[PDB]
Design a protein around this ligand. Structure first.
Ligand SMILES: Cc1cc2nc3c(=O)[nH]c(=O)nc-3n(C[C@H](O)[C@H](O)[C@H](O)COP(=O)(O)OP(=O)(O)OC[C@H]3O[C@@H](n4cnc5c(N)ncnc54)[C@H](O)[C@@H]3O)c2cc1C
Ligand SMILES: Cc1cc2nc3c(=O)[nH]c(=O)nc-3n(C[C@H](O)[C@H](O)[C@H](O)COP(=O)(O)OP(=O)(O)OC[C@H]3O[C@@H](n4cnc5c(N)ncnc54)[C@H](O)[C@@H]3O)c2cc1C
Ligand SMILES: CN(C)c1nc2c(Br)c(Br)c(Br)c(Br)c2[nH]1
Ligand SMILES: CN(C)c1nc2c(Br)c(Br)c(Br)c(Br)c2[nH]1
Ligand SMILES: [Zn+2]
Ligand SMILES: [Zn+2]
Lengths: 230, 230
């Protein structure tokens, strides 16, 4: 035991399917004795825009603004905005980061994209060197728990949407793997709006049950072959 | 040949490489006699978050907030927030929509993701049915003009990042094609920060040159094969 979990949660509605998946996670991980923290992005009115307000005090170059460089330097100089550093503290302490969100345009909702853009800066999440297998959050686990409008059928290799794995690439590989996370198998709850309550309860239950043994899981091989191969 | 272009632009710094790419597009398309509009999202302080503030009318279900449902109904009733309808007007009038942005986490910056999330609502951009080749923005063209930190070699199949086309899938297919756009080949200006001044000028001029003949181009086949190969 002694395991710490951050849930980064992106849904506007407490009563939503996403809300229930988040609450089941809190309940089950809490029951196990895990340390659990939730960043409820919409309730926080979390700022998604990458702007020069994310740096407090004097900028590295106040005439030409380069976000990547300014935030790298601000992290090194402990001069990032408190909303960012608050999130970095949560991530730093976590052994597992679970992202709970509805799929928006084959990706995360903008509020959560903004969390990734602003929280995962150079020096904290990655550096030269220290990316992919050697990214700075190595040792940590990340897990995408996604809900969709589309059915599993639509999300097949020859379905209209392609394999669900195809849209996971920028998230699992380009973001989480890049930062050094070992990536647990995604949790994809397909088309809850379409499903019967029976099927919905089953999807929630699968998640709760999965969570019972989450600490015994092996990470996926987060490779192009995993995402795009046969 | 009275063509209308919307450039949706997502960079904080007017002197940036992205800023130059946006400006040369304006210069060249204006020179051609095109009608040109730019949505400079950061300068507009464009709202990225999908929230209940985006609907001003009586909600369909005020007890359980479903963003998709409420925005679809609000579009039909004309009770969407005016920032959304302002953008929809620009898209409706445009023959070509160019997106100009730096790659953030294998995707668009959150401010631009928010534009996609909030502007491309059901009833305006797609219906059920009425998506992919039957999407509501059929007859229009879209083009991603992207800049990266990574080099072209890093973005090949055997490179660490995988092929560049891999990260285009959620944007070109999941978003643009879903809404009925035909998609012109991407413009990817690789690693300008690493490039010499002359190589930078070369990349800007290549884009300007391409734009001279943009109206003669055919779209890509926006399929899984195009993106991922056999
Ligand atoms: C901007 C935007 C972009 C989108 N892009 C995509 C896309 O690219 N691809 C795609 O596939 N979809 C897309 N969607 C659709 C979206 O992913 C789904 O609408 C979303 O995933 C549904 O999840 P939800 O939590 O909102 O469901 P909800 O509507 O909140 O819930 C579904 C039903 O489950 C019920 N429920 C809640 N809790 C429980 C419980 N504990 N047990 C049983 N039932 C319960 C709820 O009451 C509800 O009736 C998009 C939607 C929007 C708004
Ligand atoms: C949050 C975040 C996430 C990122 N994620 C990724 C990612 O997933 N993958 C990836 O590859 N990269 C990523 N990057 C890096 C990012 O994509 C690059 O920094 C960006 O694309 C560079 O474009 P720019 O316009 O900001 O370059 P700039 O720094 O503005 O341009 C480089 C140089 O070009 C000069 N210049 C400007 N105009 C001209 C001109 N007309 N002629 C000649 N020179 C000119 C500028 O003065 C500058 O010196 C990320 C960065 C951030 C901040
Ligand atoms: C709102 N709703 C039910 C919904 N929105 C969708 C979007 Br946007 C995409 Br892309 C896809 Br694919 C599917 Br399937 C969607 N289903
Ligand atoms: C800031 N900078 C230059 C930068 N950031 C990057 C990110 Br984030 C990713 Br993922 C990749 Br891949 C590359 Br290459 C990046 N290069
Ligand atoms: Zn990977
Ligand atoms: Zn397509």
């Amino acid at each position: 035991a002694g395991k710490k979990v951050l849930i980064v949660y992106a849904h506007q509605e407490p009563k939503s399917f996403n809300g229930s998946l988040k609450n089941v996670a809190v309940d089950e991980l809490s029951r196990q004795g895990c340390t659990v923290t939730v960043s409820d992005l919409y309730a926080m009115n979390f700022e998604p825009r990458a702007t020069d307000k994310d740096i407090t005090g004097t900028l590295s170059n106040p005439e030409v603004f380069n976000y990547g460089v300014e935030t790298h330097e601000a992290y090194k100089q402990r001069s990032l905005a408190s909303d960012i550093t608050d999130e970095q503290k949560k991530v730093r302490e976590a052994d597992l980061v679970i992202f709970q969100f509805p799929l928006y345009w084959f990706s995360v909702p903008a509020i959560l994209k903004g969390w990734m853009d602003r929280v995962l800066c150079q020096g904290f999440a990655f550096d030269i060197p220290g990316f992919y297998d050697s990214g700075l959050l190595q040792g940590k686990l990340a897990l995408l728990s996604v809900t969709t409008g589309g059915t599993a059928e639509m999300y097949t290799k020859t379905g209209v949407n392609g394999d669900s794995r195809y849209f996971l690439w920028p998230l699992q590989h380009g973001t989480l793997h890049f930062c050094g996370f070992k990536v647990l198998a995604p949790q994809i709850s397909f088309a809850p709006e379409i499903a019967s309550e029976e099927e919905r309860k089953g999807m929630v239950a699968a998640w709760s049950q999965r969570l019972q043994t989450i600490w015994k899981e092996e990470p996926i091989p987060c490779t192009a072959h995993w995402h795009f191969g046969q």
